[PDB]
Amino acid sequence: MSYLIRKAAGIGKGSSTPNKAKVGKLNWDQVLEIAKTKMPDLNAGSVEAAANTVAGTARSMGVTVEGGPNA
Amino acid sequence: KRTKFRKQFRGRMTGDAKGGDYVAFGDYGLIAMEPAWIKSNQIEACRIVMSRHFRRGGKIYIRIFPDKPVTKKPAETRMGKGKGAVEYWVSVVKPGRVMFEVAGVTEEQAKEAFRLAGHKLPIQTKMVKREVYDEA
Amino acid sequence: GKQPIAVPSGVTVNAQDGVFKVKGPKGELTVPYNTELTVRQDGDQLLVERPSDAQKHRALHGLTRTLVANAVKGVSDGYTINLELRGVGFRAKLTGKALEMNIGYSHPVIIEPPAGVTFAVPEPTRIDVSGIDKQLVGQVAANVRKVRKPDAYHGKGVRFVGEQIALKAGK
Amino acid sequence: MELTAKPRTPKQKLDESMIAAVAYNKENNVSFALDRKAFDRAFRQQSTTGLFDITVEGGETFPALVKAVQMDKRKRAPIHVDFYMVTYGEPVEVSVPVHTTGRSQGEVQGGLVDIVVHNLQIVAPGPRRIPQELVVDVTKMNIGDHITAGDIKLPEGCTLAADPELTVVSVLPPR
Amino acid sequence: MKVRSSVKKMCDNCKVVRRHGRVLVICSNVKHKQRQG
RNA sequence: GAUGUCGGCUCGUCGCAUCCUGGGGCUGAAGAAGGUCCCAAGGGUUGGGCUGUUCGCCCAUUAAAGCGGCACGCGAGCUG
RNA sequence: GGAUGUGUCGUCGCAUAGACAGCCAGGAGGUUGGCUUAGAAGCAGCCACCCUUCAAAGAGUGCGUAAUAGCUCACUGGUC
Ligand SMILES: [Mg+2]
Ligand SMILES: [Mg+2]
16 A cells, blocks of 8 residues: 555655655545555445545655545 | 852741642642652652653643752761851742643643652642632 | 352251251251351242341351352252373372372372362373362362472473463473 | 521531632622532532522522632632622623634644633623633644734623733644 | 562552451462562 | 770670571573572581781682671670 | 552442443454664554444554564443
8 A cells, every 4th residue: 555655656765754844745536546456355335435545544654635525 | 950149048937838829831730738848859850750751842830949048067067157058959848839730731641740750759749730710 | 249049959958046057968068157147048949138238247248148059059969170180291090088199209199088078080190079068179179289280381280171371481 | 509697707617518708799798608519519610701690598699700719728629709799781800711722733743732821801791791711713823823812802892901912822842 | 579568550460459467469470469578 | 082995815695687598479480500579586607818906808618608786795704 | 658448428420221340252454554673563662543344343452473473452242
């Protein structure tokens, strides 16, 4: 999971402090190719049950969230 | 710790706490239950203990201060004059007085941090919180 | 709390005065207790009532009831402890009424049991202690356990058949 | 809130679950003998910002607010209460608890939220129309961010008794 | 046996059971054995 | 109008906060050798070199070569 | 300084819609969270404590290994 974000955004290690100087930003369509290769291991239902779990790994790593719900 | 300048020497006497609230500054506090002479190094022990426990923040309020000179026994004597200023500095602490108060740390993060500090003190103590509104 | 007592067939509780006597098919086993607390058969089963509810009365309550159940289950079917020897060369035999162990010590250990208690050995690396009173069987087996306590490095010694032992292990 | 007698001889209440108190406005300055347990249970809910209907011996219901409490040192238990007899249309200056809402984009960064004034003095609100709390947003704050008097929302027709540039909530750095 | 004049709770396994008017501690781990004399 | 003062010798006895020996618990206790704490005062606790020395250092052994009290125990007992 | 010693009064909760304890049984997918390193995976230290499935499982408490695994708890039903 760590390598898929590191290759797409262009990260080497991660982040020493995930609260101060951030890392980068990614788009929502990129989440489709991560969950499709990691679908047999997933216990989740369909569509909404896999799109929300992947985004959480970008939190502690330092990669900023794009868009989200409402408006 | 020690004061900057003054008079040099003093005296000694006791009766119940004068100017020591409960709240103000912090959320939780530590209160003396017995009358004592709190040494400079005694406070410096408590500061360091609580300081370590919180790691980063320094949200500790030291309400007491060693504004008092104490003297000592050069080696034996009595035949001769008044004694050495430079033994220690003290804060006269009467029951009720708040010595220390903490900010931002949790209930337990304070119960324990004060428990450790108590063990470095020459007197019985107790932990306190809110509802102290005389003047603000 | 402690309240219900199951009393099958050959039970005969003659709890007169301070001697709370219990006669049955597996010999006569007597057991003494406090008179300050009440005890008698209420038709089919038994009950041990307590007067006060402070603490000194509460403590003797649960104790008095378990001990009567122990004396009841005693004269009913009986008590039997299963012990297991472990370690190279360790073995036990029978010399009449006495148990004889050969467990690593320069001389062989012999244990003559007290009254009502009986020793038995199926395979020479297994000991069986059976008798009337739970305490006497408890002690006798503990004395046999004392002969060699299982060690923290190899568990060699006298253990409780299906007994679990933690192993330190140095070298 | 209920109470009995009122003399200057307090041995009849000393050992008992009672606190000697008073209520004043500019007419009746009535002395008390209220229940310690009841006053404690209730005062902790209402504080100074709140008031309660106090019925004396028999039936004389009066609305009153808590002015000052003089508690015993050594044992933090209160010993004397001062009540202020509420009018109808206009009250006094009331110290209001300054609380916080939401996380700060500075608190998570390295520092922490420090409420300098725990209670705030406010001019002419109106009695029975007094703010029981004082919610203040902190989210906008970083490190070196102060919030003064002229930055706090006052609930309908209320004014600040304290100075315009008096620091209320400041977010402080680490160590 | 670590004879400490101030026996306190270390982990959720220690059972404080008194003996002949003295504070004694019985626990699963052998190092945890605390007494006052 | 006097309670002889250091050390030694002689003679003992007593406390235990135990040096040995006895019993235990934990151990970073495999065994052997230890460490450490608890219980324990019955007996034991070497001979020399240097120094008035107590002390201490060394030699050679030991199960061990304990620390203290007794007017820094003991001069109507000796030394000096 | 310490402690389920008994006596009496208070504060906070959880409960016959069945709790505390106890036995059967589950143990989280992501993920060997990122950093930090010769390795640091729930468990040497810096930042957070987000998500999915539901009857439930906390980037998780203490032990174990050199890092793993093991074996449990915080939480979830039955029997009571
Ligand atoms: Mg002289
Ligand atoms: Mg020994």
